Structures are given as structure tokens and as C-alpha cells.
Structure 1
Amino acid sequence: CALDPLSETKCTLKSFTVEKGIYQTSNFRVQPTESIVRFPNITNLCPFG
């Protein structure tokens, strides 16, 4: 199934001779590259100074 797009089409159609047309096999998804966390400047500093 995962060898090539035609093979995925064959698996989806459950056949060995796919006819001329357009077939939807899978869904494309973009996995997030990284995670970023942002917070405002902290003002509740301990009175060390």
C-alpha cells in the first residue's frame, strides 16, 4: 500500500486495475515543526534588591 501513489490507489479501490479517473487515497497533513511558548515580562519579582 505504501510503496507508491498508484499502489495506495490500488489499496483504496481494492482492485488491481484502476480505471481512468481521479481517486482520493489519503489526507495530507503538515506536522508542526516545533513548539514555542511565550509569556509576558514577570513583574512579581521577589524583593531581593
Structure 2
Amino acid sequence: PLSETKCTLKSFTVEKGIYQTSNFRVQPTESIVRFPNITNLCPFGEVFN
């Protein structure tokens, strides 16, 4: 983190204080897709076969 602060300040020396270096977010652990349940034996499958 000290090097990140140096980067944000673009200097090799940092004075006493608090500096906001960057941001952080918890990335999506997994992808979930949910759609309405499927009706029982629609005519689409009846047409085929």
C-alpha cells in the first residue's frame, strides 16, 4: 500500500496523513440465471416426434 500511495502522489516521499489510493469491489463469485419454471408437456414437444 505504501507504493500505491507513492504512485497516487507521484513521489518517492509521502508526508504524514491519509491518502485515498484506489477503490475495491467484491467481484461476482458466480453467475446465476433464473427464469420461470417450465410448464408440463407443452404442445411444442408434442408436435415433434
- The alignment's TM-score, normalised by the length of structure 2, stands at 0.74
Between the two structures, name the one with larger relative contact order (CA 8 Å, sep ≥ 6): 2
Deviations 1:4-44 (A, max 9, x none): x0000001001111000000011011110001111222126
CA RMSD after TM alignment = 2.3
Runs of 4 or more, structure 1, over 2 Å off, are 44-49
Output the CA distance in 2 between the equivalents of 1:47 and 1:36.
29
| Number of residue-to-residue matches in the alignment | 45
Looking at secondary structure, tell me which structure has more strand per residue: 2
Please say which structure displays the higher CA radius of gyration: 2
Runs of 5+ consecutive residues of structure 1 not aligned to the other structure: none
**Pairing of 1:9-48 with structure 2 (within 5 A):** 9-43=5-39, 45-47=41-43
Task: Tell me the percent identity.
Answer: 100
Contiguous gaps of at least 5 residues in structure 2: none
Query: Normalising by structure 1, what TM-score?
Result: 0.74
